Write a protein that binds this DNA or RNA. Structure first.
Lengths: 90, 42, 63, 65, 98
RNA sequence: GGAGCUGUCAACCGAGCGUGGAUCCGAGGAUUUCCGAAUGGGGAAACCCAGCACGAGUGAUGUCGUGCUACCCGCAUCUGAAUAUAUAGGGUGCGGGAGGGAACGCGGGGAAGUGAAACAUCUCAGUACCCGUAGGAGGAGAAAACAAUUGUGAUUCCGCA
RNA sequence: GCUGUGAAUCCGCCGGGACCACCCGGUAAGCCUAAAUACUCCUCGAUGACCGAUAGCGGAUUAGUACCGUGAGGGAAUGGU
RNA sequence: GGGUGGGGGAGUGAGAAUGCAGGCAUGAGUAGCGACAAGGCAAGUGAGAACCUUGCCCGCCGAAAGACCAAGGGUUCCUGGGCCAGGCCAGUCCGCCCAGGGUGAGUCGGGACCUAAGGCGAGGCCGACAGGCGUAGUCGAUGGACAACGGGUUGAUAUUC
RNA sequence: GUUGAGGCGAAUUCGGUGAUCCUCUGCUGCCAAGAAAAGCCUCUAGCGAGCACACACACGGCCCGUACCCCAAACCGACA
């Protein structure tokens, strides 16, 4: 995954398609993440958010529509800058 | 008269122990076969 | 007394014994090894040496 | 805990003294483990790692460094 | 490396029996199954700066606990019973009577 | 290389770490209990008991820690008996070996079953198996060879004959 | 290869399918020699008109385990929300 | 994940091998339920008791159905807890399952002392090789040597504390 | 003595019978003629200048097993 806890994503598939929210947790090998307010589970003791597979979401560029995460050349003493297409900024 | 087997581990070691297998060239070849098959030896 | 010649490496030959009916069996051709004492210089200690006859004809000849 | 470089700036006796201190630390902590009087369990790992650092510093100290 | 007696004693044995043994300052510890009575007296007397009267050692086997198919086995830890002499200083195992 | 980790089995807890570069992946390095060719000696392997030296410790024996000590072969080298030279042997020191390794190769050893509608000769076969002993490939090799007058000019391997 | 007898140094010796003569080829009884070649326990990558859990190695699952046998050795079955 | 059609290629068609692996039937709720020592009663535990518990009777071995060692087994001992499965039934209890605890040695039986029968067996002899026998030396007890007796206690240990 | 524990606690004298044990590694008798080595004691070669014996005080005295069954339900017999 190219996404971490500080990113906001849009659900692009599934019954929750259209939902946005902040990433709360990630499980790399499973490639599943927790997103506030997406897949609710009406079970508590004995609306809990469930992990969803990354390919059903797309990272929002924080400046409009969903975008694809890309990399460039910057380095600057060990610092990989993460950008995107269509006016990438971070 | 009516018996079949009367175990005694000391004797078992001195007779069937792998130390005795090491004593001979033949015994060593036995052990090396057991290693390849993957078994716990005597 | 067919030990490999101490000073040559001559060992025994192995092969067959062709009987009248051509029936083969196993036999051995041991070299004619004789017992001699080993001497390196005049008045030596006379150790021992199992040696082939060809060397008795020429080589470590003591007595 | 203590950084390896900080350990490397010490000569000999400071190393032995810190070593003894850490062994006493494990000596106490595992007794607290035996009796249940301890929450911070990872402290054991910290101290064991410190000891290992001490020994490797000693070997490199005598040998090529 | 050299002169390290603290690695011999691993812990104090916590049981009703070891509680009863507190009388006359007799304390039970788990030890490395390599050491002996002499290392134990030397280490304890040095570490705690006390007088040990005598030490009665024992080995003990673990229990062969069953799994879903096969069997396991816990460690067969060696232990030792340290009897302190009359007049020596009692030691405080962190306020842990057992 | 990069934001999450504390392996898995079976995952419920607890307590911590992480932008100062964690966890993780690759190399190098140190450490590396005990057994095993096993090599200080012994031995029901994973046990026991010792010697020497340096060092730790005790009022003092005990105890501990780290190195060293198997055998054989060869080399150097001292003495070199029995007896006179002298040698075997002995002593000191320096190098190497043993054991593993799925298959392949070389040298040496060497059956039966079966076939032959019996069966010995023969075959199955110089196979199975075993011993020695290496290698990365090995072995073989540079003509005291072929052909028989076109003559060729180290070896090995495949296909024809 | 083994045992006894036991040659020569170029007007020599060996060989050319018993053997002799002529002719021809070549000089043994010291050593080293890569390439073409044989095999894959094992380590990456790739394919497959090969099976898809009574098949594939026996081993997709605590596998050479459990278990049987004093021992050499023999040697299981169990996948799917 | 498959149909129609032309082609290619098969571990290709199960009804039997006293066939194999799995599952399930008849016999059948039959036989059997494991020495010709014998149980019975009351109260109690408990959803549930002829089989566990506590009391009281009865009966049996008593040179063994008693109490201790070795060999062997290798946690089966104790406490607490459970009763899907096991025990030839039930079974609150157990030598079944889980968790936890428990084995204290200068003097008891072994190594720290040797040794017989006997094995290894450098050196060495013999043997194609592998290898076989065997001296020194060293191992190997049921033997020989060697210093301990009584009482009490814990849930369990005892010539051990 | 909620019967778990705990406390008090007398007399303990004569005789008989009688061992497979000790005296006995002994005595007597028979023929099958009945184990090594250490250890122990003693003697010399050897070490030989600081040792030998009595009293007390103080030390240290190693390692495995030591739980549970022993003609049995726990070992060998495929099972209690």
């Amino acid at each position: 995954m190219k996404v971490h806890k500080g990113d906001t994503v849009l659900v692009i598939s599934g019954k929750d398609k259209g939902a946005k929210g902040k990433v709360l947790q990630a499980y790399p090998d499973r490639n599943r993440v927790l997103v506030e307010g997406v897949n609710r589970i009406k079970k508590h003791t004995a609306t809990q958010e469930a992990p969803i597979h990354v390919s059903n979401v797309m990272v929002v560029d924080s400046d409009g529509k969903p975008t694809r995460i890309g990399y460039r050349v910057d380095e600057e003493t060990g610092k990989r800058v993460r950008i995107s297409k269509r006016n990438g900024k971070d | 008269g009516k018996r079949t087997f009367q175990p005694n581990n000391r004797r078992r070691a001195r007779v069937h122990g792998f130390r005795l297998r090491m004593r001979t060239r033949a015994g060593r070849s036995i052990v090396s076969s057991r290693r390849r098959k993957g078994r716990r030896t005597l | 007394m067919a030990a490999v010649c101490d000073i040559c490496g001559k060992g025994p030959g192995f092969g067959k014994s062709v009987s009248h009916s051509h029936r083969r069996t196993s036999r051995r051709w041991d070299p004619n090894i004789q017992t001699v004492h080993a001497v390196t210089r005049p008045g030596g200690n006379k150790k021992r040496l199992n040696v082939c006859t060809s060397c008795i004809k020429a080589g470590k000849i003591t007595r | 805990g203590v950084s390896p470089g900080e350990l490397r700036e010490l000569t000999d006796e400071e190393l032995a003294e810190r070593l003894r201190e850490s062994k006493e630390e494990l000596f106490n902590l595992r007794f607290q483990m035996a009796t249940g009087q301890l929450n911070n369990n990872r402290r054991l790992r910290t101290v064991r790692q410190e000891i290992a650092r001490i020994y490797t510093v000693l070997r490199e100290r005598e040998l090529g460094l | 490396t050299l002169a390290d007696p603290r690695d011999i004693i691993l812990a104090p044995v916590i049981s009703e029996k070891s509680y009863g043994l507190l009388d006359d300052n007799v304390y039970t510890f788990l030890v490395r199954p390599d050491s002996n009575k002499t290392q134990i007296k030397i280490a304890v007397e040095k570490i705690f700066a006390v007088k040990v009267a005598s030490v009665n050692t024992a080995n003990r086997q673990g229990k062969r606990k069953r799994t879903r198919t096969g069997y396991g086995k816990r460690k067969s830890t060696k232990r030792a019973i340290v009897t302190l002499a009359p007049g020596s200083r009692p030691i405080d195992l962190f306020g842990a009577p057992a």
